[PDB]
Amino acid sequence: SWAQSRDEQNLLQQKRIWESPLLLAAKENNVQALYKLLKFEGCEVHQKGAMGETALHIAALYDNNEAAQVLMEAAPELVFEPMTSELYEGQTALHIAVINQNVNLVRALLARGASVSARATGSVFHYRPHNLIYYGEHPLSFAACVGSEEIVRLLIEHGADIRAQDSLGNTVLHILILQPNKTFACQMYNLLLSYDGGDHLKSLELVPNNQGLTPFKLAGVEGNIVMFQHLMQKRKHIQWTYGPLTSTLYDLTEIDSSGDDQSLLELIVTTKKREARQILDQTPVKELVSLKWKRYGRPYFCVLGAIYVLYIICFTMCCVYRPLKPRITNRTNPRDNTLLQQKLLQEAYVTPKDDLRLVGELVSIVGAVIILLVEIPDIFRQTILGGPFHVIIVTYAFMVLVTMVMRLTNSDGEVVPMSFALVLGWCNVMYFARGFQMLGPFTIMIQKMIFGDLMRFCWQMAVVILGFASAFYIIFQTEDPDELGHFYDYPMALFSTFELFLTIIDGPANYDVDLPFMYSITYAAFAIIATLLMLNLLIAMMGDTHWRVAHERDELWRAQVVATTVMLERKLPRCLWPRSGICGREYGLGDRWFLRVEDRQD
Ligand SMILES: C[C@@H]1NC(=O)N[C@@H]1CCCCCC(=O)O
Numbered sequence: 001s002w003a004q005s006r007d008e009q010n011l012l013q014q015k016r017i018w019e020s021p022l023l024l025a026a027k028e029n030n031v032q033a034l035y036k037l038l039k040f041e042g043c044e045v046h047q048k049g050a051m052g053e054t055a056l057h058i059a060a061l062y063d064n065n066e067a068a069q070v071l072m073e074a075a076p077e078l079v080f081e082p083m084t085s086e087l088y089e090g091q092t093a094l095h096i097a098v099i100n101q102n103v104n105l106v107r108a109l110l111a112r113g114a115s116v117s118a119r120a121t122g123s124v125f126h127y128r129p130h131n132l133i134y135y136g137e138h139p140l141s142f143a144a145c146v147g148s149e150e151i152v153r154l155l156i157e158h159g160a161d162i163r164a165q166d167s168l169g170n171t172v173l174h175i176l177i178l179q180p181n182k183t184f185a186c187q188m189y190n191l192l193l194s195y196d197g198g199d200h201l202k203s204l205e206l207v208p209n210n211q212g213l214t215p216f217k218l219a220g221v222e223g224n225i226v227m228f229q230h231l232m233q234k235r236k237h238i239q240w241t242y243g244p245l246t247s248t249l250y251d252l253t254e255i256d257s258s259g260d261d262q263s264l265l266e267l268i269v270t271t272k273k274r275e276a277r278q279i280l281d282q283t284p285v286k287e288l289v290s291l292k293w294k295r296y297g298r299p300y301f302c303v304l305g306a307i308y309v310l311y312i313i314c315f316t317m318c319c320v321y322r323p324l325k326p327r328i329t330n331r332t333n334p335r336d337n338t339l340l341q342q343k344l345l346q347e348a349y350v351t352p353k354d355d356l357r358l359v360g361e362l363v364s365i366v367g368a369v370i371i372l373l374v375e376i377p378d379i380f381r382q383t384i385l386g387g388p389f390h391v392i393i394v395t396y397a398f399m400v401l402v403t404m405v406m407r408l409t410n411s412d413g414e415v416v417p418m419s420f421a422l423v424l425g426w427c428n429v430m431y432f433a434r435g436f437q438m439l440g441p442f443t444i445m446i447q448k449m450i451f452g453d454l455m456r457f458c459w460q461m462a463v464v465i466l467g468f469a470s471a472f473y474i475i476f477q478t479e480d481p482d483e484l485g486h487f488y489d490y491p492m493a494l495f496s497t498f499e500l501f502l503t504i505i506d507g508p509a510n511y512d513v514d515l516p517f518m519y520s521i522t523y524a525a526f527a528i529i530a531t532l533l534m535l536n537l538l539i540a541m542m543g544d545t546h547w548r549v550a551h552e553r554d555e556l557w558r559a560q561v562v563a564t565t566v567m568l569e570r571k572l573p574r575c576l577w578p579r580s581g582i583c584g585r586e587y588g589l590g591d592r593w594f595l596r597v598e599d600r601q602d
């Protein structure tokens with residue numbers, strides 16, 4: 001493995017230090033022994049250790065300034081020498097002195113003129129999980145991360161370019177946000193901005209990542225609240241202060257739209273980082289997504305919801321009435337348990353009532369491709385948060401097409417693909433349960449919250465039985481209802497599935513008869529979903545009062561509503577859903593869009 005190798009190497013290095021008396025005296029800070037080695041013997045002062053390190057690199061590790069100065073006085077060319085090893089390719093004796101915050105050694109190394117642009121591309125320095133710290137590749141970046149402002153100043157005085165990026169395209173400002181001590185990195189963040197070019201052109205806070213992220217945008221994705229709040233200070237202007245009230249104005253530039261992915265909100269909803277979800281609760285953002293949902297967001301979800309309900313309830317209205325004929329085959333006693341009256345008329349134009357189902361069948365097709373026309377071109381440019389609605393809706397429209405392909409071929413098994421589209425269409429409309437109110441001046445958790453989680457179940461339950469009672473009816477609409485007639489007509493198919501949803505009915509079972517291939521599959525999935533919804537509901541009934549974890553269930557649901565709010569903003573045209581905030585083009589303050597927020601203090 002790779003972990004053992006460096007563990008072998010770190011142990012291998014200490015051996016060469018123990019062997020090489022120069023490296024040993026450099027580690028032990030033996031000034032008397034060093035003068036014996038370099039002056040009375042002429043030992044290899046260019047002695048490369050096991051990590052390709054010089055005696056000065058060792059003296060820089062263990063803060064031995066006396067021994068380190070002996071190596072520099074007797075050999076001043078060791079300063080420029082970097083370590084040649086693969087794990088440490090690039091690190092010089094300056095990076096070590098900056099890491100250990102040895103101000104006098106750094107002052108002495110800059111005195112002899114050490115390169116402040118020495119990039120350290122060693123394998124141990126890469127931004128990888130096995131590496132504990134990630135400080136970058138330049139000695140200035142090492143100084144900012146250790147919090148030594150005195151070293152930072154000394155490096156800038158020697159021309160340390162603050163605009164320098166590492167291999168991952170991160171400037172020194174990006175690296176500070178990734179450090180744990182965000183409380184202390186805020187102070188170090190301002191110190192580097194003071195050395196900026198002072199021009200509107202080429203601002204260091206505007207320099208993007210290799211993945212196209214500025215220090216602002218990265219702080220939101222990384223979930224660094226203190227850096228995000230700090231960065232917000234220079235992104236807002238206070239209009240006025242009227243007693244307690246303070247009407248501030250937020251820039252709202254790198255936090256909205258006008259980009260394929262140039263948008264912080266799209267990054268928060270798609271990240272695998274759980275910490276980043278706390279960003280959209282901040283005081284320039286929690287007002288934004290709330291206004292996007294309160295108007296234009298909440299109504300269009302119900303409009304598209306009612307359309308999708310009428311779409312699915314029509315597809316079922318055409319599924320309940322399908323071609324019916326007796327089995328017209330003497331094969332009713334061969335396999336006597338057989339009891340099918342299979343029916344595929346496959347060409348009937350009997351149109352007193354079939355023209356009504358003919359136009360309905362075309363609605364089921366033109367919408368399924370429309371579902372594909374709004375989902376298939378979206379997969380090319382996938383995270384559920386967010387709901388698996390998108391995954392379930394595309395397979396539904398895939399099933400309607402298969403049922404269409406199962407038609408025009410008269411395949412005996414057109415019940416199998418038509419059944420999967422029934423539950424996939426309905427179970428997708430329980431995804432429409434999220435809505436109503438997400439406002440929260442007071443994040444309210446009481447009896448209202450238990451009642452809130454119970455009504456989603458009633459919505460989830462009523463939807464599930466509609467998708468499965470219609471399914472169970474189709475399966476047994478063909479068979480003979482004299483034996484196992486739990487679903488002989490639609491009102492009894494619902495009442496049976498309703499009863500079976502609560503496990504009161506024994507469940508349709510008959511063993512002297514052979515039942516269709518679909519009943520065992522559908523009822524097995526029915527028992528799992530029906531118990532999970534009852535099991536999931538039992539947690540919400542208790543997970544609301546035992547602790548403030550109701551706020552944890554609440555805040556994740558808001559992120560689901562916010563993730564849906566960003567979903568309704570991509571495919572919808574521009575004539576609807578106007579842009580958030582107010583533009584800055586006459587009145588003159590643009591060319592950005594600003595959000596007006598006023599708060600009160602007590
Ligand atoms: C101690 C080792 N000896 C040495 O001369 N350089 C190494 C420094 C170790 C730093 C490893 C930083 C990391 O985990 O990436």
Ligand SMILES: [Ca+2]
Nearest residue numbers: 504505506507
């Ligand atoms: Ca029973």
